Structure formats: structure tokens, C-alpha cells
């Protein structure tokens, strides 16, 4: 079938500066009446994908210049020559030119800012849930920048994997950070057999851990 | 001023049906071409199905064929995608689009939610996080709300009814033993909570709830 790949699949690239992404197609997408119909949209998170360009190079309404679209053949590229935070998010191209209309995979542009320390905070099972027989403690490290980063959870001072669900935002456009969560889930039984528990993290910005941490008795 | 809003997600057994809708404005929605486009678990996106303008003419991607109708109603602006025989391919964010001819998939809906499983509807646990062992570095305090144990996607969540959305994380659910779990924070300036109130609003569309939960803090 026609295929179409991207790439890169994630594009690393700091504000004001040029980005390029590439569309190749596995047969040539020149149609039978010799237009070419690519298309590039861009998915911003939380969003609905939005057009940017539509037959290689033409501009969808209120899409800057700063956007722009070539190629022939097999070979597409968006460019956007000077990068905004506001630009962040999936760009996938997609052909209508032969049957059937197939989109790219996706390529993620990644805004390559300052780093930015976690804002760490630790949040006891709230007494409402430990009728359900389980307790839930969860973790948030908000707003930082890179995404590398190393968390892990102590009760009693002895490490925890056992239990613990993270999940973690992507990119947000506001400040360019990511966020993550953690949250180490236990019976009420084991949850009152110990007193302290713990949420640690390492990061660029911070090599030694930062520690937050509560006693299951203090309120 | 285009608006696209789609309903009727939620979730449907497997080799079951569903109808999903969706209500155009602000166009003359009987001259255009009009589609439904899906995305993925994997957020890869699938061309799904078609309808000329009239209504007359319909193409289908040839997984759905003979399974999905597209239809459409001119007089009251609305599309509609009938699904049946159902699978789980089929589990996807559905968006209907305008498509203008070769000059795209120019305005899209926000999309509803469709799962297909065998497992039951279960409606959120819904927790209040207050912050523990903490009050240092900076004059904010960081808030949640923990939204545990439901089935399907998805939730919305906000706080105090949208008015707080410029310091708010929701994170993704994880999904552990045919449930989900999600966290949503709000940071927001030390001097308005607790002297102030914080709800977050969570809506279960598949169950039919809504839950507030005022955040109040911890005590003895």
C-alpha cells in the first residue's frame, strides 16, 4: 500500500531557531492528474489537529509564514523557520493522492529550553480512602526540564517499586516543561504496619535527591 | 465561529454498535464534503469514512466497510457515523472534519471517545489531595485530586468550574486491572487556599457523574 514515514520521530529544537521534519512516501504521490495532494497538520496537546498546509505548500488560514512546505515526488518537508513555544506538539503529514488516504506516523517537536528544577510535593492517602482497604500516596514533580528523571519511593526508609504507577504530561506550551506523577498504592493493612514513606527525586538539576517525605500518625 | 461537536462515544461491547453524531454551525455544513477521522491508542491517525455533500456518494476505509454508514442530515446539520460489529481496532478518539475537496481536513470537532471492551463501566473514586510535609521554597501551595478506579475514558477535569486553569496538570490515566487512575494539581498563590475555596469538577460522560470535591486541609 502506500506508506508514508516520517522523520525524526522526535525533534529536539530551541525558540528562534529552524526546524525541519520529512515526509517520504513508499511510491511517488504525483495523482494521475499530475497534482500532488500532501497536507500537514499539526496536533497541539490537549488539542484537535489543525491544518497548517494542504497541496505541499499552500497555506491554511491564519498559518504564519514561518511554515512552510515543499517537496515533490517522494519527499516532503514542513519547515518552520523560526520556532515558537506555541508550535509544540505532533505534526503529522497525510496523503490523499492514491488510495487509500493515509496519514504519517507523527513526528513530535520538542522545545529545547532552559533547565528547570521539579517542584516535588508529597500527599498523604486522604483518611477517606482507607475504608476501601487501600491507601494511595502520590507524589507530584511539576514543571521541569529535561524529562530524564529518577524517582523512587522509601517507607520505612527501604526502597518501594512494588505498587507505584507513574504517569507524566508532555510538553506544556506555557513554559515548555514537563510534569510527572507517582503514586505508590498498598492494602490499608500494609499501609499501617509503617510509619514513614518517602518520594524522592534526582535530576539534572539536582543530583542530590530531593526528599519529601510524611509520617502516617502526623495530620 | 466554526464549531464541530461529536457525541455518542462511550463504551460498546465487542461485536456490538454504537451511533456516533455530530452537530455543525456557523457553515453551510449541506455544500461540503464532510469526514470521520479517528486516533489511535498508539495517537496515530486513520482516515475513516467519507459522505459527499448530498449524501449520495460515501467511501469507507476497507476495515470499516460493511460495518460503519456514514450519514448525514442537511436540514438540522448533523453527521453521523453508525458503527457495527464492532473490535478493538476500533477503540479511538473520533473527530468529524470538514474536508474542502484537495484543500484539506480544514476544521475538526474535538472528538468522543469510543472503547470497545468487554470490561464494565465503573464510575471514579474521587480523593482529595492536601498537601502533607511540605510548606517551604516558594509562596505557592500545589493541590489535587486523585480520580481512581473508573472505566472508560475519559474524564474531565477542572477547577472551580474552569476559573483556575492557568496552574493545572492533569495527568494521564494509567490503566491497572481493566480500571484507570489519574491525578489532576492546581498550583495556586499561598494566600488564596485555605482561605478560599478549590473544587475540582470531574465528569465520567460513560457513567453519567459529576463529582465535585472542595479540597479542604488536613487537621488533627
Redesign the interface.
Known amino acids: 500500500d502506500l506508506l508514508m514515514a516520517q522523520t525524526p520521530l522526535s525533534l529536539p529544537v530551541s525558540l528562534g531557531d529552524q526546524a525541519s521534519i520529512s515526509c517520504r512516501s513508499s511510491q511517488s504521490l504525483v495523482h494521475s492528474s499530475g497534482?500532488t495532494?500532501l497536507?500537514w497538520?499539526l496536533q497541539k496537546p490537549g488539542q484537535?489537529?489543525?491544518?497548517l498546509i494542504?497541496?505541499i505548500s499552500?497555506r491554511?488560514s491564519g498559518v504564519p509564514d514561518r511554515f512552510s512546505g515543499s517537496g515533490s515526488g517522494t519527499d516532503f518537508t514542513l519547515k518552520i523557520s523560526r520556532v515558537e513555544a506555541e508550535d509544540l506538539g505532533?505534526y503529522?503529514c497525510?496523503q490523499?493522492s492514491h488510495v487509500?488516504?493515509?496519514?504519517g506516523?507523527?513526528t513530535k517537536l520538542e522545545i529545547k529550553r532552559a533547565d528547570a528544577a521539579p517542584?516535588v510535593?508529597?500527599?498523604?492517602?486522604?483518611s477517606?480512602?482507607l475504608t476501601?482497604g487501600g491507601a494511595?500516596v502520590?507524589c507530584?514533580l511539576?514543571n521541569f526540564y529535561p524529562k530524564d528523571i529518577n524517582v523512587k519511593w522509601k517507607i520505612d526508609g527501604s526502597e518501594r517499586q512494588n505498587g507505584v504507577?507513574?504517569?507524566?504530561?508532555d510538553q506544556?506550551s506555557?513554559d515548555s516543561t514537563y510534569?510527572?506523577?507517582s503514586?505508590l498504592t498498598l492494602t490499608k493493612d500494609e499501609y499501617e504496619r509503617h510509619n514513614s514513606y518517602t518520594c524522592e527525586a534526582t535530576h539534572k538539576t539536582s543530583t542530590s535527591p530531593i526528599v519529601?517525605?510524611?509520617?502516617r500518625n502526623?495530620? | 465561529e466554526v464549531m464541530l461537536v461529536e457525541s455518542g462515544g462511550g463504551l460498546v461491547k465487542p461485536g456490538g454498535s454504537l451511533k456516533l453524531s455530530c452537530a455543525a454551525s456557523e457553515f453551510t455544513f449541506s455544500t461540503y464534503i464532510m469526514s470521520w477521522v479517528r486516533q489511535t491508542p498508539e495517537k496515530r491517525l486513520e482516515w475513516v469514512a467519507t459522505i459527499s455533500s448530498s449524501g449520495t456518494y460515501t467511501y469507507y476505509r476497507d476495515s470499516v466497510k460493511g460495518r460503519f454508514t456514514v450519514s448525514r442530515d442537511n436540514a438540522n446539520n448533523i453527521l453521523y457515523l453508525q458503527m457495527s460489529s464492532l473490535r478493538s481496532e476500533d477503540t479511538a478518539l473520533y473527530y468529524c472534519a470538514r474536508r474542502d475537496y484537495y484543500d484539506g481536513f480544514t476544521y475538526w470537532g474535538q472528538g468522543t471517545l469510543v472503547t470497545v471492551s468487554a470490561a464494565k463501566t465503573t464510575p471514579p473514586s474521587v480523593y482529595p489531595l492536601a498537601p502533607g510535609s511540605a510548606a517551604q521554597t516558594n509562596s505557592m501551595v500545589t493541590l489535587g485530586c486523585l480520580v481512581k478506579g473508573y472505566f472508560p475514558e475519559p474524564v474531565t477535569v477542572t477547577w472551580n468550574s474552569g476559573s483556575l486553569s492557568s496552574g493545572v496538570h492533569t495527568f494521564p490515566a494509567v490503566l491497572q486491572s481493566d480500571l484507570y487512575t489519574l491525578s489532576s494539581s492546581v498550583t495556586v498563590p499561598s494566600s488564596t487556599w485555605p482561605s478560599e475555596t478549590v473544587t475540582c469538577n470531574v465528569a465520567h460522560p460513560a457513567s453519567s457523574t459529576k463529582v465535585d470535591k472542595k479540597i479542604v486541609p488536613r487537621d488533627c
Open positions: 497534482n495532494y497536507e497538520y484537535s489537529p489543525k491544518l494542504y497541496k499552500n491554511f505532533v503529522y497525510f490523499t487509500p488516504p493515509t496519514f506516523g507523527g517542584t510535593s508529597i500527599f498523604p492517602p486522604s477517606e480512602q476501601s494511595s502520590v507530584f511539576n504507577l507513574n504517569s507524566w504530561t506544556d506555557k510534569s510527572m506523577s503514586t519529601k517525605s510524611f509520617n502526623e495530620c
